[PDB]
Design a protein around this ligand. Sequence first.
Ligand SMILES: *[C@@H]1O[C@H](CO[C@H]2O[C@@H](C)[C@@H](O)[C@@H](O)[C@@H]2O)[C@@H](O[C@@H]2O[C@H](CO)[C@@H](O[C@@H]3O[C@H](CO)[C@@H](O)[C@H](O[C@H]4O[C@H](CO)[C@@H](O[C@@H]5O[C@H](CO)[C@@H](O[C@H]6O[C@H](CO)[C@H](OS(=O)(=O)O)[C@H](O)[C@H]6NC(C)=O)[C@H](O)[C@H]5NC(C)=O)[C@H](O)[C@@H]4O)[C@@H]3O)[C@H](O)[C@H]2NC(C)=O)[C@H](O)[C@H]1NC(C)=O
Ligand SMILES: *[C@@H]1O[C@H](CO)[C@@H](O[C@@H]2O[C@H](CO)[C@@H](O[C@@H]3O[C@H](CO[C@H]4O[C@H](CO)[C@@H](O)[C@H](O)[C@@H]4O)[C@@H](O)[C@H](O[C@H]4O[C@H](CO)[C@@H](O)[C@H](O)[C@@H]4O[C@H]4O[C@H](CO)[C@@H](O)[C@H](O)[C@@H]4O)[C@@H]3O)[C@H](O)[C@H]2NC(C)=O)[C@H](O)[C@H]1NC(C)=O
Ligand SMILES: *[C@@H]1O[C@H](CO)[C@@H](O[C@@H]2O[C@H](CO)[C@@H](O[C@@H]3O[C@H](CO[C@H]4O[C@H](CO)[C@@H](O)[C@H](O)[C@@H]4O)[C@@H](O)[C@H](O[C@H]4O[C@H](CO)[C@@H](O)[C@H](O)[C@@H]4O[C@H]4O[C@H](CO)[C@@H](O)[C@H](O)[C@@H]4O)[C@@H]3O)[C@H](O)[C@H]2NC(C)=O)[C@H](O)[C@H]1NC(C)=O
Ligand SMILES: *[C@@H]1O[C@H](CO)[C@@H](O[C@@H]2O[C@H](CO)[C@@H](O[C@@H]3O[C@H](CO[C@H]4O[C@H](CO)[C@@H](O)[C@H](O)[C@@H]4O)[C@@H](O)[C@H](O[C@H]4O[C@H](CO)[C@@H](O)[C@H](O)[C@@H]4O[C@H]4O[C@H](CO)[C@@H](O)[C@H](O)[C@@H]4O)[C@@H]3O)[C@H](O)[C@H]2NC(C)=O)[C@H](O)[C@H]1NC(C)=O
Ligand SMILES: *[C@@H]1O[C@H](CO)[C@@H](O[C@@H]2O[C@H](CO)[C@@H](O[C@@H]3O[C@H](CO[C@H]4O[C@H](CO)[C@@H](O)[C@H](O)[C@@H]4O)[C@@H](O)[C@H](O[C@H]4O[C@H](CO)[C@@H](O)[C@H](O)[C@@H]4O[C@H]4O[C@H](CO)[C@@H](O)[C@H](O)[C@@H]4O)[C@@H]3O)[C@H](O)[C@H]2NC(C)=O)[C@H](O)[C@H]1NC(C)=O
Ligand SMILES: *[C@@H]1O[C@H](CO)[C@@H](O[C@@H]2O[C@H](CO)[C@@H](O)[C@H](O)[C@H]2NC(C)=O)[C@H](O)[C@H]1NC(C)=O
Ligand SMILES: [Ca+2]
Ligand SMILES: [Ca+2]
Ligand SMILES: [Ca+2]
Ligand SMILES: [Ca+2]
Lengths: 388, 388, 388, 388
Amino acid sequence: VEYRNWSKPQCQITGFAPFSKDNSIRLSAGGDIWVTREPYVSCDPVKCYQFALGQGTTLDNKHSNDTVHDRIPHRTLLMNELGVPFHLGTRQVCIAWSSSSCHDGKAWLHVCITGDDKNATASFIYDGRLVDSIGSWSQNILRTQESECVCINGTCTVVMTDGSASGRADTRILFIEEGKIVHISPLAGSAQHVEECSCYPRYPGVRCICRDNWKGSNRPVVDINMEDYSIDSSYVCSGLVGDTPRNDDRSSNSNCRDPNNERGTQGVKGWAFDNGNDLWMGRTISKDLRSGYETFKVIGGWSTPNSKSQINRQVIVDSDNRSGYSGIFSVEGKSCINRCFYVELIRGRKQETRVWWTSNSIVVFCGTSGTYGTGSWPDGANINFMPI
Amino acid sequence: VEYRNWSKPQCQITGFAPFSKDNSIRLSAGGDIWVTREPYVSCDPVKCYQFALGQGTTLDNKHSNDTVHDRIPHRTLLMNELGVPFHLGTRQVCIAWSSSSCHDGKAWLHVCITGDDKNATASFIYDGRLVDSIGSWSQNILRTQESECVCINGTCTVVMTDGSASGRADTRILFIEEGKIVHISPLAGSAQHVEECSCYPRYPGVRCICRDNWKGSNRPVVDINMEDYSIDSSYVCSGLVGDTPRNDDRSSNSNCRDPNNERGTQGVKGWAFDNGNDLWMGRTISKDLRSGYETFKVIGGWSTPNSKSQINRQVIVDSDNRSGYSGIFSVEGKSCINRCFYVELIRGRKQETRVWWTSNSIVVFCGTSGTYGTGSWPDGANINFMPI
Amino acid sequence: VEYRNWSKPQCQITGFAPFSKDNSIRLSAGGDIWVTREPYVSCDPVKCYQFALGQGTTLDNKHSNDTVHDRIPHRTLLMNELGVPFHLGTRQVCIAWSSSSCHDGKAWLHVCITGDDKNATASFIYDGRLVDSIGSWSQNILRTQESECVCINGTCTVVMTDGSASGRADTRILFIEEGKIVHISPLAGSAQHVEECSCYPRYPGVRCICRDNWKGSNRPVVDINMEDYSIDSSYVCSGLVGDTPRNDDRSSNSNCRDPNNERGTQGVKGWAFDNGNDLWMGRTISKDLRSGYETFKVIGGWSTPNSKSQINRQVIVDSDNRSGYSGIFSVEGKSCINRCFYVELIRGRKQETRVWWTSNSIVVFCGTSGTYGTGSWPDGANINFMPI
Amino acid sequence: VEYRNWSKPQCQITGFAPFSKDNSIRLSAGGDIWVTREPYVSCDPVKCYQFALGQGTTLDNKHSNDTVHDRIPHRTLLMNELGVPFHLGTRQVCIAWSSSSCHDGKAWLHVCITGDDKNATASFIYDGRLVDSIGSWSQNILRTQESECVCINGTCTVVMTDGSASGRADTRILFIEEGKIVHISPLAGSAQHVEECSCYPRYPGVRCICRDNWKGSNRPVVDINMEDYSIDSSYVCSGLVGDTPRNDDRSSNSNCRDPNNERGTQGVKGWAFDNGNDLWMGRTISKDLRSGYETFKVIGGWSTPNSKSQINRQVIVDSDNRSGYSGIFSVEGKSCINRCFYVELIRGRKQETRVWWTSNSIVVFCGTSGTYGTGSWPDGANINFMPI
Ligand SMILES: *[C@@H]1O[C@H](CO[C@H]2O[C@@H](C)[C@@H](O)[C@@H](O)[C@@H]2O)[C@@H](O[C@@H]2O[C@H](CO)[C@@H](O[C@@H]3O[C@H](CO)[C@@H](O)[C@H](O[C@H]4O[C@H](CO)[C@@H](O[C@@H]5O[C@H](CO)[C@@H](O[C@H]6O[C@H](CO)[C@H](OS(=O)(=O)O)[C@H](O)[C@H]6NC(C)=O)[C@H](O)[C@H]5NC(C)=O)[C@H](O)[C@@H]4O)[C@@H]3O)[C@H](O)[C@H]2NC(C)=O)[C@H](O)[C@H]1NC(C)=O
Ligand SMILES: *[C@@H]1O[C@H](CO)[C@@H](O[C@@H]2O[C@H](CO)[C@@H](O[C@@H]3O[C@H](CO[C@H]4O[C@H](CO)[C@@H](O)[C@H](O)[C@@H]4O)[C@@H](O)[C@H](O[C@H]4O[C@H](CO)[C@@H](O)[C@H](O)[C@@H]4O[C@H]4O[C@H](CO)[C@@H](O)[C@H](O)[C@@H]4O)[C@@H]3O)[C@H](O)[C@H]2NC(C)=O)[C@H](O)[C@H]1NC(C)=O
Ligand SMILES: *[C@@H]1O[C@H](CO)[C@@H](O[C@@H]2O[C@H](CO)[C@@H](O[C@@H]3O[C@H](CO[C@H]4O[C@H](CO)[C@@H](O)[C@H](O)[C@@H]4O)[C@@H](O)[C@H](O[C@H]4O[C@H](CO)[C@@H](O)[C@H](O)[C@@H]4O[C@H]4O[C@H](CO)[C@@H](O)[C@H](O)[C@@H]4O)[C@@H]3O)[C@H](O)[C@H]2NC(C)=O)[C@H](O)[C@H]1NC(C)=O
Ligand SMILES: *[C@@H]1O[C@H](CO)[C@@H](O[C@@H]2O[C@H](CO)[C@@H](O[C@@H]3O[C@H](CO[C@H]4O[C@H](CO)[C@@H](O)[C@H](O)[C@@H]4O)[C@@H](O)[C@H](O[C@H]4O[C@H](CO)[C@@H](O)[C@H](O)[C@@H]4O[C@H]4O[C@H](CO)[C@@H](O)[C@H](O)[C@@H]4O)[C@@H]3O)[C@H](O)[C@H]2NC(C)=O)[C@H](O)[C@H]1NC(C)=O
Ligand SMILES: *[C@@H]1O[C@H](CO)[C@@H](O[C@@H]2O[C@H](CO)[C@@H](O[C@@H]3O[C@H](CO[C@H]4O[C@H](CO)[C@@H](O)[C@H](O)[C@@H]4O)[C@@H](O)[C@H](O[C@H]4O[C@H](CO)[C@@H](O)[C@H](O)[C@@H]4O[C@H]4O[C@H](CO)[C@@H](O)[C@H](O)[C@@H]4O)[C@@H]3O)[C@H](O)[C@H]2NC(C)=O)[C@H](O)[C@H]1NC(C)=O
Ligand SMILES: *[C@@H]1O[C@H](CO)[C@@H](O[C@@H]2O[C@H](CO)[C@@H](O)[C@H](O)[C@H]2NC(C)=O)[C@H](O)[C@H]1NC(C)=O
Ligand SMILES: [Ca+2]
Ligand SMILES: [Ca+2]
Ligand SMILES: [Ca+2]
Ligand SMILES: [Ca+2]
């Protein structure tokens, strides 16, 4: 086997094609399916896997009541082949209420985080063995990506932060070889607050579009130099803006340098990737709630301050349906490396009240250079048929 | 590994031997089994798999109500080893309310179709990656085979149509190498309307017996020249006739050239294959409803206009039991390549009314050059023990 | 890979050691477990598998009612690793209400029989493909081994019979290479009626201890010469006698040549194997019912007419618990080839009446040349906790 | 493949990092999960597996009532990948109410014990085949490790005892090559009573910290010389003491040579391992009940009589939650061999009375040379949501 070095042009894409949907909540009304959240899909050199943070219970289980809480000792990283849902024969790969997994070519690395908020611990499991660990540097919820990490020539890099949610925080980018933390680099550049990076290889670097939870609606950008371990950060140029809350397109801005300060506080995990000076990105259709999901290209979206010229829009989940987190993943193709994304469709509390649980299903699309039509692929569960 | 080129004589067969039955509906009254329809089985060079379009739910689930509808965003192509039923650990290979899968020797290709009726999109997933896609050319339900596609020396060919159901439509035959559409050829020859082809290798070509939904009871024939990408189409000569509705054998005809216009409209997916000037084929025993299933050889059935000389008949499902779609699949043997078939036994609505769901189970037989006896192998579920 | 030629001395054994138990009926009162009967375990060169004829349903299913019947179109041969029970993800390898499976070194062969009693059909599935078939020669329930077949240098041999149950019948021994019936040899020698052979390699031959359903309580012996395809048959010498009904040891006899005519009619599948002039064998503890199971060596049991000198007795299931069929299986060891056996513990109707189903679990032991103690390992299900 | 010879320095560790948790009891209130006890995890050269003694039933099954009993004929050794829980597709590897499993590099060895108390039998299954067996030498419950055995260069060694619980007993250490008992060595040295050894490679020897059930609260030490088959035994020096009941740290002692006679009788399976003259160990937080679990280093804990200097303490399960058995397991690292441990969290009777079953879940941690924080990871099931 050899290590992945991702040195292939990004594929030219026209938009996104349907790829998978696991239908976990519809199935949960007639099956023993895990309660999850924060899903992501990462993919080894032969096949893809879907991951999620389980709540240590199944939906038709009395223990599903009050699973809105993001951190309990019973959360484990579930790992399955993309498309097979989280049934009882699913493997719990590690204890984690925050994770990132990636494969370096030769084996999988999982960074799982559990523990006390104020004194959490992160374990670096590589190829089955626990090879390293690190404790909470700012005593306030050590967290990471919640989507795939990326590895070039042996080194994987994950970005993690500990600190305030909506306040300044301490973000560091760890570089790790075979499970072992070989370097830690603090965040440098313009970004004010990094939460949940959606990173992707951009040989010879890695680039991430993260979430700004303090002062923005525009999304942070974190650039990692795998050779010097140098970090750089910015905001995505596009005036169209990916976070939720967001202003609305008439009143929204980004100057590529600072948090725009328009409905800053909070976010939702999202992604975007550059294509020359253009930007492919996705966001909720709502600017207040995480409902609906749409994708489009923004001409000049990457390189020009405030560019709002959209084209190739696609609705992935209509505005009357719920979405959640979203992240990117890259698959090596024969000729180029493509970009794909998943979108979490959360259901349950607090928004839907009939039931007392909170869980999600996923839908995933991949870039295509061919043609496509139209559609909307929501979760599909009728809330009145669910248990609880 | 090397690519399949299927250059081996067709095996001489005497009739059909029992091969598999998964018992999905009997099992569904005491287990969490997927609701499906449009099953097919395709087979890689070491083993066989059964496929079906799931309705994103299990039978003992309130979401199974009203699964008669053929297209919803929650349908996925399920794939399992032949004989293991669609339980909750089954993989959903792609989003699809229409499909065709085949293996070129080196990996699997799946063509999955989802989307809006009027603007559907087809993704070409090969070896795990999404390698291509195509949008609806006639804005009216892009559809394909619903059974195995076939590949010779690297190129796979699927036939798809977009257009009217019972009216003229636009049928094209796509040739694809490693997931990539490398050529599209429109339907040429005598056939008036192609729906659901049951194709099979006939080195160096591929031959399909499809469904004519507009003007026939006799079945279309589509011949693909893998070297020039030339298409040709006809109708099966046999006066015995494979579609349902059908006239009855006294009053039925086929001249090998045109839709016979005897109870044309509608169909059911079926198959047939040639053997010299003879024809092996199967059909429902009923000519009105898709009930019972029988197979037989028709002497001169392939080459002579209206030949109705039957021999070697076998009942696979008695006339008092339901059948559904049927299709062919080919398995490479040591000496020759054999032909086998599956027959979908649908249950539920609209025909059976106690329950509110619609689903199927399968039974599959393979050609044999040996001896065999008699039997009838229906679905078996007692409708009064089923949920709903 | 290479073919198995089984040329290694039989291991010297002292008695039997516990090996597996799957606990299917206890589990069925809290799980979706298949209803089965006629189990057997066969073993490929790296691991072992347990097989059973399923009744196309699970126990907590209304379709389990009246599963006492031995032949319905919904019976399939289930195959799993020894120890993993028949849950819903179990593969149905073929349609069969009678079977025998074995592995020639290079792949598995399964002979599955389904159909009409009076006109059944047997398919020879080898390595996934259906390679041959044969119809019922005497129009009265074609049947076979119900335990492992054995293959030496490529040729597998199964013994099958068609004819009267308790009356004369037509027994033939088929020799098959890669799924293909290459020779059929009729039964020759002293045996009057062969039903359910428990065969085992005895290089260069194969030897079977079968069931005599017409005139005996002593067990038939069938000897196959793999080189000339010559058959020979006898009765086991031992005056202790393996069938049920049986007389009792005071009044029982066998002269090694003829059916003893002591409580002839009927039987139960059993086994025995020779060791020099001695005989290792097992039988129900009851002589009327198939309850309890015991094993022992009979000094001179193989070579001397009526020898009743027992030693090394072991109780495998106490007399207050039910047993059923039993059969042998051989595993290649480093030095010698060992013999092991399974014993079906049937539960349900007609003997236990609370419930309306009939099913079994298995327990299996293997020969040992070491020491052992004592015990009794019954099914274990409390009939009052079962569904139905 | 080659045999494991474990010749690598023990890794220097700082404490323990979270590794796995399977959540079996929370899941059992909405899933068909096996009732177990005496879990352990052993690990082959590529991945790890969790093992447990099943009670031949699932929790939501009426057969789970009264599973407090440690020995019934229906107990089997369940084996799964670490993290996938004991669902119905889990393999029952052998009949056993006591076990130890290990992998020699080339294949797995399982020593399973079943039978009558007074006349039990142990089978040595290696690589699938039953290769040997041994009967009860003292006619009073033959038992073994209940955790991993260890193999160096081909020879595996398990320690087993037969005799009184709280009284003198007969302990022997068997050395076995490929399933075959090649030598048996009786216990020699200072230890008075050995029960449940937690052994680990310490090239070229093997070292075990066991349970003294007669006269101690300090833990026995058993040293095996793989070259001469010589045994030696002692007590762990530390005055801090690992058994439960225990005195309390003010009043507790160990002189490294004799049972301390402070609350001797009974125990609980535990572990400890040396590091120079220090000792890493774990124990219940309670000294009366097996509740809570803590680990720490004891400076001079290995080499100095009665050393009570603790440091690096970690709470793994808080004192208000239940624990149970605990044992060690070793994983080969790139550079050194690490030590990890699991802790059984038993639930049910006799301590919790609402329910009538007894079962456990596991949590496992591995040594780390990095940093870590704090936490408590209990079972998590709310006893009021459980069946029964
Ligand atoms: C499979 O699927 C199908 C279809 O699926 C769609 O189904 C629903 C449920 C969706 O949510 C999807 O998920 C799905 O896609 C199902 O089939 C349907 O099932 C329904 C039952 O669940 C059945 O019945 C419907 O159900 C609807 C909701 O469930 C109702 O909206 C509908 O009725 C509505 O209008 C009624 C108007 O009259 C109203 O009734 C009130 O009742 C009283 C009756 O007495 C009215 O008046 C009487 O009132 C007083 C006393 O109370 C006086 O009496 S008296 O005379 O003095 O004595 C009045 O004078 C007297 N009225 C007179 C004389 O006129 C009262 O006034 C009404 N109230 C009002 C405000 O008007 C009711 O409240 C509703 O508003 C009806 O119940 C569907 O028909 C059925 N569909 C089909 C095709 O069959 C399947 O069930 C599922 N399930 C399964 C297992 O498969
Ligand atoms: C079958 O399926 C296909 C594929 O999915 C689908 O085609 C796609 O249609 C969408 C929706 O119309 C297209 O996306 C739009 O693209 C335009 C820009 O392209 C046009 O204009 C440029 C020049 O500017 C030309 O070069 C080009 O040829 C086109 O003529 C965008 O403007 C669209 O964005 C606006 O509309 C969105 C909704 O569609 C809004 O949500 C968004 O906020 C934008 O609105 C704002 O700007 C408008 C003016 O710019 C203004 O009027 C508004 O009020 C507001 O201020 C959108 O990106 C997509 O490109 C097509 N993709 C491809 C590959 O063709 C078919 O439509 C579908 N058919 C059916 C029947 O379903
Ligand atoms: C045990 O199992 C075996 C194997 O399954 C089974 O054998 C098979 O039996 C079937 C049913 O009879 C055979 O199929 C029939 O074949 C005849 C033609 O063969 C005969 O005639 C030719 C000359 O024409 C001879 O060379 C040959 O030797 C035979 O004598 C067909 O005519 C049959 O079709 C008609 O009958 C069907 C029902 O059987 C109708 O549904 C069908 O529509 C046809 O009817 C029409 O034509 C008839 C005149 O041609 C007319 O009388 C009717 O009214 C109507 O117009 C059918 O194909 C099959 O070949 C056998 N297969 C083999 C390999 O032997 C055993 O029967 C079975 N035994 C038991 C006890 O179950
Ligand atoms: C712990 O576990 C071990 C291993 O399982 C167990 O040892 C085994 O015990 C059984 C039961 O006793 C032994 O099997 C018996 O063997 C005798 C023959 O051996 C003796 O005699 C010969 C000479 O004849 C000596 O060479 C030899 O040393 C022995 O002394 C058989 O006769 C036994 O069969 C009779 O008894 C059965 C019940 O035990 C009956 O069901 C059976 O029908 C036979 O009865 C008939 O014959 C009797 C006279 O022959 C007559 O008295 C009766 O009325 C009737 O007509 C049986 O095979 C077995 O060999 C032992 N195995 C080994 C390897 O040692 C321990 O017993 C067990 N301990 C505890 C406490 O549980
Ligand atoms: C975030 O997470 C980290 C990592 O888990 C955690 O750090 C760890 O904290 C624990 C708990 O305090 C530390 O363990 C203690 O270590 C001391 C010894 O170390 C000190 O003293 C030596 C000199 O003796 C110095 O060299 C060294 O620098 C330290 O200053 C032990 O004494 C502790 O044991 C006693 O306390 C236990 C409870 O903590 C008792 O249960 C135990 O029985 C011992 O008590 C007895 O002795 C006491 C005097 O010796 C006496 O006062 C008592 O009454 C009684 O007689 C314990 O082992 C551990 O080493 C830290 N690990 C590392 C790597 O740093 C952080 O605390 C955590 N932060 C938050 C906010 O959660
Ligand atoms: C079809 O594929 C087969 C399988 O590879 C080809 O067989 C090879 O061709 C010649 C002799 O037939 C030699 O190159 C090899 O020895 C053959 N393969 C094997 C596995 O023996 C065959 O030529 C192909 N035929 C066509 C018409 O394409
Ligand atoms: Ca924000
Ligand atoms: Ca028609
Ligand atoms: Ca008899
Ligand atoms: Ca003690």
